[PDB]
Short mmCIF file of C-alpha atoms and ligand atoms in Angstrom, two decimals:
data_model
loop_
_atom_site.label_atom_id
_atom_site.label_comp_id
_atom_site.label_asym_id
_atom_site.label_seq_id
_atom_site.Cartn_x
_atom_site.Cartn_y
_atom_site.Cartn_z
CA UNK V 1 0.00 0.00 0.00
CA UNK V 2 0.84 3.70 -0.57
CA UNK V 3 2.86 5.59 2.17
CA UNK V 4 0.14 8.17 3.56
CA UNK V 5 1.90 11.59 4.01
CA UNK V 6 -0.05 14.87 4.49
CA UNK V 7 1.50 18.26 2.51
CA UNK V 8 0.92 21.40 4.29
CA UNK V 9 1.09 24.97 1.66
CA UNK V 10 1.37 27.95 3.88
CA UNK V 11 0.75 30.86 1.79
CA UNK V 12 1.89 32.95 4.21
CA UNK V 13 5.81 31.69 4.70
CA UNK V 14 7.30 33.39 1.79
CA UNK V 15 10.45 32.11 0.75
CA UNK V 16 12.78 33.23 -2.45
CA UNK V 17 11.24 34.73 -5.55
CA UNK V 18 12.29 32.07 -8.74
CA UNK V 19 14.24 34.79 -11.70
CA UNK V 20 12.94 34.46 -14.77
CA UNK V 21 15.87 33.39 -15.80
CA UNK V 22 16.98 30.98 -13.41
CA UNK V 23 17.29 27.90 -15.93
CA UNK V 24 20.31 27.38 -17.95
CA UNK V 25 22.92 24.88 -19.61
CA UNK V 26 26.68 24.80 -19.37
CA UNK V 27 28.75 23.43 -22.38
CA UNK V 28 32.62 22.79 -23.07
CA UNK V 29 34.45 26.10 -24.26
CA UNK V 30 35.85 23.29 -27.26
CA UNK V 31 32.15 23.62 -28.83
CA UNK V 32 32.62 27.09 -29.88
CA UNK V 33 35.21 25.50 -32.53
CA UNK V 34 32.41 24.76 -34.46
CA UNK V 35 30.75 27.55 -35.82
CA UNK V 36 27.30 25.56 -36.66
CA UNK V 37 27.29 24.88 -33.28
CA UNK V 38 26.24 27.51 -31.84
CA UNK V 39 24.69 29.19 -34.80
CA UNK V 40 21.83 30.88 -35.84
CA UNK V 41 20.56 27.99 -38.13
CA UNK V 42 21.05 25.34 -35.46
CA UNK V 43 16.78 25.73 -34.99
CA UNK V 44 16.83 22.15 -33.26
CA UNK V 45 19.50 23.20 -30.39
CA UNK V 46 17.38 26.35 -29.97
CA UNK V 47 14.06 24.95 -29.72
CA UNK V 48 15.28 22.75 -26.85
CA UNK V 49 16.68 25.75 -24.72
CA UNK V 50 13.21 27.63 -25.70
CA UNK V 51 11.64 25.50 -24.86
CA UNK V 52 13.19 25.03 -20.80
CA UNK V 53 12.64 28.57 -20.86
CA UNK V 54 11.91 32.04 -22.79
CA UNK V 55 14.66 33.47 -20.49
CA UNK V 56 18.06 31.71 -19.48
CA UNK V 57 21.24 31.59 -19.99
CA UNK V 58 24.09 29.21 -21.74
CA UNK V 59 27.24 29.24 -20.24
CA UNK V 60 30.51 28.08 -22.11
CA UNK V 61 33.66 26.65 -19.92
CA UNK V 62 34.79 23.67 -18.78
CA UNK V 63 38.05 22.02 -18.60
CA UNK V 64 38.27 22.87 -22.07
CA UNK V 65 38.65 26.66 -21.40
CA UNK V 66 41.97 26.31 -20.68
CA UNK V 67 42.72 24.57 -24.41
CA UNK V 68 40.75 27.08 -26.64
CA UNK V 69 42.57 30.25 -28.22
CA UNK V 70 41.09 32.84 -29.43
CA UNK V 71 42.66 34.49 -32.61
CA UNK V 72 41.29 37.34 -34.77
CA UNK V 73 42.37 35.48 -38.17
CA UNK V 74 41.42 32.14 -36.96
CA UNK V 75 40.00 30.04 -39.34
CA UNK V 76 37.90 26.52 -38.39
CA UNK V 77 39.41 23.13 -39.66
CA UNK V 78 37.63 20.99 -41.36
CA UNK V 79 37.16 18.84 -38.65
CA UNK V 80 36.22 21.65 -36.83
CA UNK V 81 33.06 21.97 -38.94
CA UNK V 82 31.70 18.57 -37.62
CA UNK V 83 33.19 19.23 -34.15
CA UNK V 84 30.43 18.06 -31.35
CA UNK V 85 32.24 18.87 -27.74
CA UNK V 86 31.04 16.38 -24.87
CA UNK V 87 31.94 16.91 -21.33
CA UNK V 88 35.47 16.88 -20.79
CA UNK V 89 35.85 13.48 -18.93
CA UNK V 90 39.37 14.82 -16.98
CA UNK V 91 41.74 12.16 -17.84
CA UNK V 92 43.94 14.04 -20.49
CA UNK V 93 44.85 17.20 -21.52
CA UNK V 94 42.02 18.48 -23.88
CA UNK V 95 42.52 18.75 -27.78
CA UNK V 96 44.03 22.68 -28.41
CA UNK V 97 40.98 24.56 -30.67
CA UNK V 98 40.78 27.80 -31.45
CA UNK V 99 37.91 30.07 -31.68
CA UNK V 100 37.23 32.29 -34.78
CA UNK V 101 35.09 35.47 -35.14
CA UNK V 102 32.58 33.39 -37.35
CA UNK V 103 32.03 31.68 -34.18
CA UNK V 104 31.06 34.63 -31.88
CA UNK V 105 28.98 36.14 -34.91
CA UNK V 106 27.38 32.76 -35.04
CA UNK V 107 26.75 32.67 -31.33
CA UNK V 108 24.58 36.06 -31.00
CA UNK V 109 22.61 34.57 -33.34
CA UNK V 110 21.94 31.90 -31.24
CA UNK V 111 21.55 33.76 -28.37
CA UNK V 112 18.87 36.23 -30.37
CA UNK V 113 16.61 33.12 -31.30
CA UNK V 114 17.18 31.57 -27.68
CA UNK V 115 16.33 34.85 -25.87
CA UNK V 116 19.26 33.72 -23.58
CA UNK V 117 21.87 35.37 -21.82
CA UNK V 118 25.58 34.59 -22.10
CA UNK V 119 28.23 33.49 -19.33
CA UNK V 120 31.63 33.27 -21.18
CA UNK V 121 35.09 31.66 -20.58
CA UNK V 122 38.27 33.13 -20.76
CA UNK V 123 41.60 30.95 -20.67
CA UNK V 124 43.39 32.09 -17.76
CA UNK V 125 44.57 28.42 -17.93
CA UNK V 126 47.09 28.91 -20.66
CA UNK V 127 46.05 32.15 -22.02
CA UNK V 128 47.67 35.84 -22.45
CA UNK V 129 45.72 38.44 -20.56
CA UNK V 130 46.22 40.47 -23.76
CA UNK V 131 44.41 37.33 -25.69
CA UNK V 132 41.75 37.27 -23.19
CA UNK V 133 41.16 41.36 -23.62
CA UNK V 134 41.12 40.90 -27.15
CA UNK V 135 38.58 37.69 -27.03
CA UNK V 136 36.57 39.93 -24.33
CA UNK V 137 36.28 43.19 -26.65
CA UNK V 138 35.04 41.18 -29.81
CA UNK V 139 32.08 38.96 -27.26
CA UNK V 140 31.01 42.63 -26.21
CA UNK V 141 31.50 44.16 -29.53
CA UNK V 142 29.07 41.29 -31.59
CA UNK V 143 27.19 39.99 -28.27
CA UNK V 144 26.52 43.11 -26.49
CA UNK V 145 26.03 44.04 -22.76
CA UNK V 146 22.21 43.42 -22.21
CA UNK V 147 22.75 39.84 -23.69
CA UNK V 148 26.73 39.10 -21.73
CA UNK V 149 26.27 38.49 -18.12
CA UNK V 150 29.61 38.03 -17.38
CA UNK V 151 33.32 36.83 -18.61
CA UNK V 152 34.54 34.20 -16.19
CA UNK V 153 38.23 33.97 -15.66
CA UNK V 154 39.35 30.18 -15.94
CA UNK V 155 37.29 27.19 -14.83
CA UNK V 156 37.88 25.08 -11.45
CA UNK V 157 41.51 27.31 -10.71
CA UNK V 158 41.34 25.10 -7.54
CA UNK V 159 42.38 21.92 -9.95
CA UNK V 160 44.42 23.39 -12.57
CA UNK V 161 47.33 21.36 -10.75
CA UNK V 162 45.55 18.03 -10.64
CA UNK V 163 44.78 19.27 -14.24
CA UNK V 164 48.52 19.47 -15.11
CA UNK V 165 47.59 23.41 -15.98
CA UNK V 166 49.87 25.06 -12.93
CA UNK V 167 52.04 23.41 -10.83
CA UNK V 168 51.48 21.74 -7.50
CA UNK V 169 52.34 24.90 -5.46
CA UNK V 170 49.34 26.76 -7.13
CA UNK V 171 47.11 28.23 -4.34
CA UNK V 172 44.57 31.38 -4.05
CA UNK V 173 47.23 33.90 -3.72
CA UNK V 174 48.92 32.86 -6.95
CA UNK V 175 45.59 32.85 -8.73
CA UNK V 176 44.71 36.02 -7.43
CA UNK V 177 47.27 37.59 -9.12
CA UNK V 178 46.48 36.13 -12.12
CA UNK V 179 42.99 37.04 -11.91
CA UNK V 180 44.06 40.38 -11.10
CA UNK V 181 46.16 40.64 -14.12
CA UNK V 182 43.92 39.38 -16.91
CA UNK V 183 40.67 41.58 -14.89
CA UNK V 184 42.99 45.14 -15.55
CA UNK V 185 44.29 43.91 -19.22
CA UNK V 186 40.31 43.33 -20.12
CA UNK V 187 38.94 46.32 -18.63
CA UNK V 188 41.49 48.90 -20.42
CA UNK V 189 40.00 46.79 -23.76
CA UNK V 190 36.42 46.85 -22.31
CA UNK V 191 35.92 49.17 -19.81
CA UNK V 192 32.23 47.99 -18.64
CA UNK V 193 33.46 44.05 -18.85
CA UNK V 194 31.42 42.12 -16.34
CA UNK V 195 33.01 39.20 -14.18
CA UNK V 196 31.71 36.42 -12.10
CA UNK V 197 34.22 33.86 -10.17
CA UNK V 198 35.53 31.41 -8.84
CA UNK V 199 33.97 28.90 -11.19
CA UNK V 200 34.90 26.06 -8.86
CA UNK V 201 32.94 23.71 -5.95
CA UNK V 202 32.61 26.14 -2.99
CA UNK V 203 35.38 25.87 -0.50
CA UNK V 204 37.28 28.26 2.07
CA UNK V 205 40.49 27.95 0.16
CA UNK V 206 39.52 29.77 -2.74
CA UNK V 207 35.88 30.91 -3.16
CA UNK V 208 35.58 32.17 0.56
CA UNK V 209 39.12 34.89 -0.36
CA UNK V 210 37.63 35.25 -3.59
CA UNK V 211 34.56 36.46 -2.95
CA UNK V 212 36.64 39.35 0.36
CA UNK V 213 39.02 40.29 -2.54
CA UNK V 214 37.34 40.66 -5.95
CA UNK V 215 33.47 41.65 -4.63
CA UNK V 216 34.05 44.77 -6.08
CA UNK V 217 35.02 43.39 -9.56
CA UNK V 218 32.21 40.96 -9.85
CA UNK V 219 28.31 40.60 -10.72
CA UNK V 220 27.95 37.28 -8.43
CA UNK V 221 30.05 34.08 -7.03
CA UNK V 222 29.75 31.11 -9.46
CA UNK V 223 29.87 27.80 -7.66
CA UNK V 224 30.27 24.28 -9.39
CA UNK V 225 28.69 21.21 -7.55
CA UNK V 226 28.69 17.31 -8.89
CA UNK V 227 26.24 14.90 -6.74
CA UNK V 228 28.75 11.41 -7.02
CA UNK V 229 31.96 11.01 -8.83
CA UNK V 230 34.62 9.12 -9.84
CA UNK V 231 31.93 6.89 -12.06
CA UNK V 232 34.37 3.89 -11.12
CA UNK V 233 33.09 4.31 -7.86
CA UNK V 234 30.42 1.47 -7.43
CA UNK V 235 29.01 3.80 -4.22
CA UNK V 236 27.80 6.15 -7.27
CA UNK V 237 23.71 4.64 -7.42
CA UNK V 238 20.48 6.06 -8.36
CA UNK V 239 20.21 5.29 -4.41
CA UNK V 240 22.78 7.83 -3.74
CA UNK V 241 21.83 10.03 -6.17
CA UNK V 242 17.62 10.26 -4.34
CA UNK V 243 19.40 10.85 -1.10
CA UNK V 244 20.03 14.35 0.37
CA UNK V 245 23.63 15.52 -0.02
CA UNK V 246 25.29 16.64 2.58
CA UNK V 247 28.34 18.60 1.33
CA UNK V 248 25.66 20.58 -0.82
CA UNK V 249 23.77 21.64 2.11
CA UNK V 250 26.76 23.23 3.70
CA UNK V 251 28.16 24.75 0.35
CA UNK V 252 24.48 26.00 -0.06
CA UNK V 253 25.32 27.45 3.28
CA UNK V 254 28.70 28.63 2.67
CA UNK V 255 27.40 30.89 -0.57
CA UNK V 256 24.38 32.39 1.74
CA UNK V 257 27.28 33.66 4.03
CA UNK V 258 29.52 35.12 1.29
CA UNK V 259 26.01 36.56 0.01
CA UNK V 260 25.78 38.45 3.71
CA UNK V 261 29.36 39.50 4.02
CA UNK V 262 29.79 40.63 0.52
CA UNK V 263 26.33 41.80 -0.99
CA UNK V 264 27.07 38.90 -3.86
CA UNK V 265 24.45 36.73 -5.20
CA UNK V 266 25.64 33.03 -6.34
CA UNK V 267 24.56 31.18 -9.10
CA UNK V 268 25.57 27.32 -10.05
CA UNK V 269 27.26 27.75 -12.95
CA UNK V 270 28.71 24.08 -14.00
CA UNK V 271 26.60 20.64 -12.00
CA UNK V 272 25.61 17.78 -12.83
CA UNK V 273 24.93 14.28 -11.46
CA UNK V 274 28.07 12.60 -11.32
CA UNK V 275 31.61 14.09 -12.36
CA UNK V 276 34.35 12.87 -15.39
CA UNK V 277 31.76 13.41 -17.71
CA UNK V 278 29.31 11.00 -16.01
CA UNK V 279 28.04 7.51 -15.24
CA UNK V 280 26.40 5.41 -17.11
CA UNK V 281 23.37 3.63 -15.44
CA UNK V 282 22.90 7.07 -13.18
CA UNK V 283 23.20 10.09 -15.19
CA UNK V 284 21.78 8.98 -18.72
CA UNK V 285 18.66 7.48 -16.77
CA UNK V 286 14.80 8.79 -15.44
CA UNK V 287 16.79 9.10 -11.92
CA UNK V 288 18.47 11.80 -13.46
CA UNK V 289 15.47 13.95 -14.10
CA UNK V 290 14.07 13.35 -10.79
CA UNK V 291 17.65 14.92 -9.10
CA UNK V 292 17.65 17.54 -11.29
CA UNK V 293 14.42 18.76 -10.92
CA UNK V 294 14.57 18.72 -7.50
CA UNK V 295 18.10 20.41 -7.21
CA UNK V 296 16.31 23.50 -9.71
CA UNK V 297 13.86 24.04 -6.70
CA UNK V 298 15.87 23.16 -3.76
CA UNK V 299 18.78 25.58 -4.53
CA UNK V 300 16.14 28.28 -5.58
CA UNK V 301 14.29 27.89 -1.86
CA UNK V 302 18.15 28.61 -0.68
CA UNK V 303 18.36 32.05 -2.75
CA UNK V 304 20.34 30.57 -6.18
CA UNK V 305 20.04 33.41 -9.26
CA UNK V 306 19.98 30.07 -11.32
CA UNK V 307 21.39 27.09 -12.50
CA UNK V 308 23.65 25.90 -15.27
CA UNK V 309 23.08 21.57 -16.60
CA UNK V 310 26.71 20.51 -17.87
CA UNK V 311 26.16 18.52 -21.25
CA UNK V 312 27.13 18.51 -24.47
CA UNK V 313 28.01 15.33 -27.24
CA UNK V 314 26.29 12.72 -26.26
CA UNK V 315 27.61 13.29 -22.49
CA UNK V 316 26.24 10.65 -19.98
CA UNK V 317 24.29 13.83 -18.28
CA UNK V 318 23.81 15.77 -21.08
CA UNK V 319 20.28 17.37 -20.90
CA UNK V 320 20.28 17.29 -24.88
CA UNK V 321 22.51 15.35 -26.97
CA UNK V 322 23.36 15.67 -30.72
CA UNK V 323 24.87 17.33 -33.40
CA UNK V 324 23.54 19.93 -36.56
CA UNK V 325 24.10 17.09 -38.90
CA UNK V 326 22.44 13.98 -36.91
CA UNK V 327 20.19 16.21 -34.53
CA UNK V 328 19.07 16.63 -31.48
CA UNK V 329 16.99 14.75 -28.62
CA UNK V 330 16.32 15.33 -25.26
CA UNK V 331 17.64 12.58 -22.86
CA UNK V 332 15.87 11.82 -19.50
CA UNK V 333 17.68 14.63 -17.30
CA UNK V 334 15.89 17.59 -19.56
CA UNK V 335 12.55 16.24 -18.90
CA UNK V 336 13.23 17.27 -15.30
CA UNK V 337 14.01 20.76 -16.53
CA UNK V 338 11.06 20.78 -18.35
CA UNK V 339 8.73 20.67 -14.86
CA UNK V 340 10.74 23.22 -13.71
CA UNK V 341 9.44 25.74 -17.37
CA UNK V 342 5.89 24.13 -17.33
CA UNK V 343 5.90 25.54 -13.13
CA UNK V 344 7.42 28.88 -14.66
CA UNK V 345 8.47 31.85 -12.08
CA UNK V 346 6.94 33.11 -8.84
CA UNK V 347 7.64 32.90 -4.95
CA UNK V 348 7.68 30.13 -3.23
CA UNK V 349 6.15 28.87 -0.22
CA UNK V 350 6.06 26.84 3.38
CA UNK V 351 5.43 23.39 1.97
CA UNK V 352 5.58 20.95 4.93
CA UNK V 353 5.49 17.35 4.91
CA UNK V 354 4.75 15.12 7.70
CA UNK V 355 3.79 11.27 8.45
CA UNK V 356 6.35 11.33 5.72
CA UNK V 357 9.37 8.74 7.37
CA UNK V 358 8.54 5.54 5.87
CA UNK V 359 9.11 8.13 1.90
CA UNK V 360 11.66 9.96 3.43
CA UNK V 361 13.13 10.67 -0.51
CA UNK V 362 9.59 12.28 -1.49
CA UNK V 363 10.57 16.03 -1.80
CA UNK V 364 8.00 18.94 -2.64
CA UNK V 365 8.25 22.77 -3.29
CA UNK V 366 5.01 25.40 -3.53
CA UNK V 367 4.84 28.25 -5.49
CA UNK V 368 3.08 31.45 -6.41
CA UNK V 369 2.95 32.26 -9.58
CA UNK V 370 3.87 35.47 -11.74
CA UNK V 371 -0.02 34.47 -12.96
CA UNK V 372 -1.21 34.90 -9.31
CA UNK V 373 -2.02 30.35 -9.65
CA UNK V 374 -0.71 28.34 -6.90
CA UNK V 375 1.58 25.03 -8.26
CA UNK V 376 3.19 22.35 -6.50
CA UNK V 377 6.03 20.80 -7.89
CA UNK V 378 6.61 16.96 -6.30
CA UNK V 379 9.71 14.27 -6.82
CA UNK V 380 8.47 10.79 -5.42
CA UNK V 381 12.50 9.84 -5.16
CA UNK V 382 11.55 7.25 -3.06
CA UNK V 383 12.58 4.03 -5.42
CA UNK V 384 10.74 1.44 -3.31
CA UNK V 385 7.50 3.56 -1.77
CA UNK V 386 4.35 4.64 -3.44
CA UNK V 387 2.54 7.77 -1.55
CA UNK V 388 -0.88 9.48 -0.97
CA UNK V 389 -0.05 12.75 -0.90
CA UNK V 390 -3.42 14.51 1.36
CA UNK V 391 -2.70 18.45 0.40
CA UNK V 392 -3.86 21.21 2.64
CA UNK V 393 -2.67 25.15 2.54
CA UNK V 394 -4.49 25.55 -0.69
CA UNK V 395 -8.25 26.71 -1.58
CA UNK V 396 -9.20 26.48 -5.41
CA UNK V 397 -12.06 25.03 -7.20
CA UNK V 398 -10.05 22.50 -9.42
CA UNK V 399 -5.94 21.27 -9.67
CA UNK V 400 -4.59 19.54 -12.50
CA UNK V 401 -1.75 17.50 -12.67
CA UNK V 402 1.05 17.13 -15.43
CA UNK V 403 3.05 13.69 -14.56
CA UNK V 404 6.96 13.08 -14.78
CA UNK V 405 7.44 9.26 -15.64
CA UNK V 406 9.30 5.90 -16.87
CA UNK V 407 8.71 2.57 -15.99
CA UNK V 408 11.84 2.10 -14.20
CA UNK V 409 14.01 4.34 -12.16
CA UNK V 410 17.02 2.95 -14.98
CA UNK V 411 15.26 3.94 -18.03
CA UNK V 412 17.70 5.34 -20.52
CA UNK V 413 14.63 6.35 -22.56
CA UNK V 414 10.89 5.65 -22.10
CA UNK V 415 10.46 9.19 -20.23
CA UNK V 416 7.43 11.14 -20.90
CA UNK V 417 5.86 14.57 -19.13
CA UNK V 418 2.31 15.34 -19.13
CA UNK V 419 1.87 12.11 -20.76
CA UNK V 420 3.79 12.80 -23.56
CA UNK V 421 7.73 12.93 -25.20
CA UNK V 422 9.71 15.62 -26.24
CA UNK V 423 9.53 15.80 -30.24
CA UNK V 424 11.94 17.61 -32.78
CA UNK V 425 13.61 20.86 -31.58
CA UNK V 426 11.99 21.05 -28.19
CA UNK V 427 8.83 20.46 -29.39
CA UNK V 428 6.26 19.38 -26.37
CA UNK V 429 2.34 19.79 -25.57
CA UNK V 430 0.70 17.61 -23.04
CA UNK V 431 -1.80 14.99 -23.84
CA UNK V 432 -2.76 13.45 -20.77
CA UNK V 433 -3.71 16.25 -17.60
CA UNK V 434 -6.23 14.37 -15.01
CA UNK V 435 -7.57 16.62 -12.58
CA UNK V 436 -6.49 16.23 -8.72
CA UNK V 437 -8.58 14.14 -6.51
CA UNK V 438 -10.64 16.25 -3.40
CA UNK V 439 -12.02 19.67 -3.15
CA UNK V 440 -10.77 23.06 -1.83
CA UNK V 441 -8.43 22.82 1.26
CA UNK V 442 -8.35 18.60 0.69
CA UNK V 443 -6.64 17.54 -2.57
CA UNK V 444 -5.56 14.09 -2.61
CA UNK V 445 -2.34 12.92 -4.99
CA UNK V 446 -0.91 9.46 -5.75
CA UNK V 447 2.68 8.99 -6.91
CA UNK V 448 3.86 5.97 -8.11
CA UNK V 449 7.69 5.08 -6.66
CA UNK V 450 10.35 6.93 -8.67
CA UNK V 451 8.21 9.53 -10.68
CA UNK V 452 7.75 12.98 -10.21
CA UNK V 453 4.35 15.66 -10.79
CA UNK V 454 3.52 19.05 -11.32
CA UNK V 455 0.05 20.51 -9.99
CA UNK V 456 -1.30 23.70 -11.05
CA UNK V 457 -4.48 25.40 -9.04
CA UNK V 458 -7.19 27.80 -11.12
O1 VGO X 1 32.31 16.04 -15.77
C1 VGO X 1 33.20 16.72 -15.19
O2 VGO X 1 34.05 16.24 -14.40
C2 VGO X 1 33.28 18.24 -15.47
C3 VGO X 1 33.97 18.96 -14.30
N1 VGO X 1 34.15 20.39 -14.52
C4 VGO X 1 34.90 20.69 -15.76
C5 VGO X 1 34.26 20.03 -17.00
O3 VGO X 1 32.96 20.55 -17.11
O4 VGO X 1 34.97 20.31 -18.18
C6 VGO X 1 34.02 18.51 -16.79
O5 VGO X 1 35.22 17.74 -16.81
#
């Protein structure tokens, strides 16, 4: 039988406002080789970020920010044409690309039939500060101010050792100067440059100093965060992956501080489920959209500007995989994004669960909308429980509810939202919305183990 919990919506304990453009996707810096890439006639890679949201934005970094050189008579190689980037897995050194100005032209276009914003890699890595002022004044010369949202200055500094990019004795001081250097050669190219930084996990060695020395030189902190990693690991489960985390909690808690202390907002800028690119069997699976989903709303209800899927190729966690030439699909981890659009923005609210222990893993988040319509956003993570879900808090005449599904928790594929799949280029319309069970102030909502369901309130 189901496990009986009671959900409690208290319209009255207002919690963060969700930005309209809290949503986003982080790919490798190597993509940007590829001019069709990121293009104006890629319509299939567009209609997918449309379609998470009409605002949002793409940021471009990775490991493979420290391999990409910018040069003003750069010209793509052929294999550059077919290039399709995946998620650096961080074994090797990446391949050495260089960027052209095709490829930023190309890009604005992209970002002008997205309606996205733009976070953008420089190589600090191995990079000239005079290269990076010179890649920074031709992204604000084609992409413009109201559409950049910041240049970040090398990705995960904290590993570039590990990375073989600095040597072992590389710490926050030497980065700082660094930093310092290619932030003055930048700003004498492009004087109203914005920054964001560290671009690494949160940790007191180097985001805590970051954030005391640079606040005055940057729009917002920009934190990384993987759920499980090495994919060796056989700890690394969908289990795992349901459970609370920890050492996000207190990073969460960490960037609220450095908010207080320094004015600066934070946004997750490079996450996904499992790090080196992935795990197979966990991040390419329904699980996947169920942890991702969840994470969107959980880090907004801790005061996140937004949120930023690592993907690309055909990544293990990529939230869309493909190429111009082959196309694109969504794989399981976008159709928890897609919740996230269909709730859209608004400020959410107390949403307590009790009688709850035997479905610990059952998570749920309440929201007013921008449309004034109450929604509820659930994740039944629990891979063994069903629940009845008895709702209270909330007084309308009729609720509806759009359901997040596979047959199995390890489905690859299979995955369908509001009783339906994402089609070509983003494409999606429900077909199946059943109406929630009760009356004002006493809804009643099954959920199936390992599925997931958005409820919307006239
Ligand atoms: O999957 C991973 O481990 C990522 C970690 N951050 C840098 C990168 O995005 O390039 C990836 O290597």
């Amino acid at each position: 039988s189901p496990v009986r919990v009671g959900l409690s919506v208290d319209a009255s304990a207002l919690g963060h406002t969700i930005p309209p453009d809290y949503t986003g996707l982080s790919y490798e810096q190597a993509q940007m080789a590829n001019p069709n890439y990121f293009s104006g006639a890629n319509t299939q890679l567009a209609g997918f970020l449309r379609t998470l949201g009409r605002q949002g934005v793409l940021r471009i970094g990775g490991n493979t920010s420290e391999y990409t050189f910018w040069n003003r008579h750069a010209k793509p190689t052929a294999a550059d044409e077919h290039l399709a980037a995946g998620p650096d897995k961080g074994h090797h050194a990446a391949a050495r690309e260089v960027i052209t100005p095709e490829a930023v032209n190309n890009l604005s276009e992209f970002l002008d039939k997205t309606g996205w914003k733009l976070i953008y890699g420089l190589n600090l890595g191995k990079g000239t500060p005079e290269n990076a002022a010179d890649e920074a004044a031709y992204v604000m010369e084609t992409i413009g101010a109201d559409r950049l949202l910041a240049f970040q200055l090398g990705n995960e500094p904290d590993l570039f050792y590990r990375n073989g990019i600095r040597p072992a004795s590389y710490d926050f001081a030497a980065y700082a100067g660094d930093w310092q250097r290619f932030f003055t050669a930048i700003r004498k190219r492009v004087p109203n440059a914005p920054f964001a930084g560290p671009d690494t996990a949160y940790n007191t060695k180097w985001l805590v100093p970051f954030a005391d020395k640079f606040k005055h030189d940057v729009k917002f902190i920009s934190s990384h965060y993987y759920a499980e990693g090495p994919p060796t690991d056989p700890s690394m489960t969908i289990e795992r992956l349901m459970k609370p985390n920890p050492r996000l909690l207190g990073e969460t808690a960490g960037l609220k501080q450095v908010e207080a202390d320094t004015g600066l907002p934070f946004r997750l800028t490079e996450t996904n489920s499992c790090y080196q690119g992935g795990k197979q069997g966990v991040s390419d699976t329904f699980a996947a959209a169920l942890w991702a989903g969840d994470l969107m709303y959980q880090q907004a209800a801790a005061g996140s500007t937004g949120i930023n899927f690592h993907g690309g190729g055909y990544g293990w966690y990529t939230p869309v995989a493909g190429t111009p030439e082959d196309g694109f699909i969504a794989r399981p981890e976008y159709y928890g994004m897609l919740l996230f659009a269909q709730a859209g923005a608004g400020q959410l609210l107390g949403a307590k669960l009790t009688d709850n222990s035997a479905a610990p893993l059952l998570t749920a988040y309440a929201l007013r909308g921008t449309d004034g319509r109450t929604r509820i956003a659930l994740f039944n993570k629990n891979l063994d429980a069903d629940v009845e879900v008895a709702i209270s808090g909330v007084a309308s005449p009729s609720g509806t509810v759009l359901r997040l599904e596979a047959p199995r928790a390890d489905d690859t594929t299979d995955v369908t939202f509001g009783g339906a799949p994402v089609g070509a280029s983003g494409s999606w319309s429900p077909l199946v919305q059943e109406y929630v069970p009760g009356h004002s102030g006493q809804f009643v909502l099954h959920m199936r183990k390992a599925s997931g369901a958005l409820l919307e309130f006239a």
